[PDB]
Amino acid sequence: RHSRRAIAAETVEILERGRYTAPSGRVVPIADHVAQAVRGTRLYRPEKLAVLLEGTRIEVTEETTLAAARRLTGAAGDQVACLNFASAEHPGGGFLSGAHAQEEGLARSSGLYASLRAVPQFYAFHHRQRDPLYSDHLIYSPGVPVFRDDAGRLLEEPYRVAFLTSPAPNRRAIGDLRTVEEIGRVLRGRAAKVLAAARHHGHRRLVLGAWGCGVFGNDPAQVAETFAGLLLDGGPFAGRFAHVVFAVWDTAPGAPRHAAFARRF
Numbered sequence: 001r002h003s004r005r006a007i008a009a010e011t012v013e014i015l016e017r018g019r020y021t022a023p024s025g026r027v028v029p030i031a032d033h034v035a036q037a038v039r040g041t042r043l044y045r046p047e048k049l050a051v052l053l054e055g056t057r058i059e060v061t062e063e064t065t066l067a068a069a070r071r072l073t074g075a076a077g078d079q080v081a082c083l084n085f086a087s088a089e090h091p092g093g094g095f096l097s098g099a100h101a102q103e104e105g106l107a108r109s110s111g112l113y114a115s116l117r118a119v120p121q122f123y124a125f126h127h128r129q130r131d132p133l134y135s136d137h138l139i140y141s142p143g144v145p146v147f148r149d150d151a152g153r154l155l156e157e158p159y160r161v162a163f164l165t166s167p168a169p170n171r172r173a174i175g176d177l178r179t180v181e182e183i184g185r186v187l188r189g190r191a192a193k194v195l196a197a198a199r200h201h202g203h204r205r206l207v208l209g210a211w212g213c214g215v216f217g218n219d220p221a222q223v224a225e226t227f228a229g230l231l232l233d234g235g236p237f238a239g240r241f242a243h244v245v246f247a248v249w250d251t252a253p254g255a256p257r258h259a260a261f262a263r264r265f
């Protein structure tokens with residue numbers, strides 16, 4: 001936790017100073033790209049996403065979200081979109097406290113926090129709502145510079161990705177007070193809106209994963225099935241993306257989140 005906390009603090013300083021020093025000694029400017037990402041950040045309310053809905057190579061890997069994004073970005077020039085497994089309540093989750101989860105890693109490694117911290121309406125809505133289902137609100141963050149690898153090392157050459165920030169329902173907090181089918185409907189509606197936003201913004205290649213299946217305690221078979229219904233068997237997004245990677249990095253024994261996605265896809 002202490003090493004992650006230190007890295008998080010360094011990233012915040014970097015975003016303030018607008019440059020960082022790579023291991024070679026190269027000083028890398030990022031202010032322009034960060035400012036662009038912030039200025040282009042958009043909050044989508046549920047009903048706007050619903051409007052977007054009125055209008056493929058599939059891989060499962062043990063990659064982190066960022067490792068998959070970096071691989072895809074090196075292979076072609078079209079900007080990749082990545083799903084941020086978001087906190088409903090804090091931009092970048094607990095990254096500044098040294099918390100260890102997917103969003104926190106994104107926030108330690110990129111300009112994502114500068115984008116999300118600029119959308120207080122998203123977080124205020126959920127704070128007032130006080131409901132663990134959260135909502136279909138989504139933050140779209142274009143061209144966010146990514147400048148660390150999985151180990152926290154600064155990159156000689158940063159790359160840019162779009163992020164889609166949407167919180168999965170906190171099934172852990174809900175317990176058995178909603179049915180499997182109710183949660184499935186919430187997941188399907190929300191995932192459809194994530195995909196609609198990605199497509200709306202011209203992203204043909206996506207990095208998805210075990211959304212909500214860690215701290216939020218969702219069932220990875222159900223989350224994998226949710227994406228499958230949308231992307232496969234003549235679903236609404238079948239054939240609409242060029243490349244979808246389910247990058248599932250699961251350090252628990254048996255890597256069960258990854259196993260569930262591998263089984264389905």
Ligand SMILES: Nc1ncnc2c1ncn2[C@@H]1O[C@H](COP(=O)(O)OP(=O)(O)OC[C@H]2NC[C@H](O)[C@@H]2O)[C@@H](O)[C@H]1O
Nearest residue numbers: 064065085087093101102212213214215216249250257
């Ligand atoms: N970096 C990364 N890449 C890919 N997959 C990952 C990664 N880190 C974890 N995982 C896998 O994805 C699963 C879900 O990750 P998690 O970050 O726990 O997402 P949640 O939606 O359940 O939790 C979110 C909340 N945690 C941090 C945020 O601030 C949100 O509060 C997790 O169980 C792992 O199997």
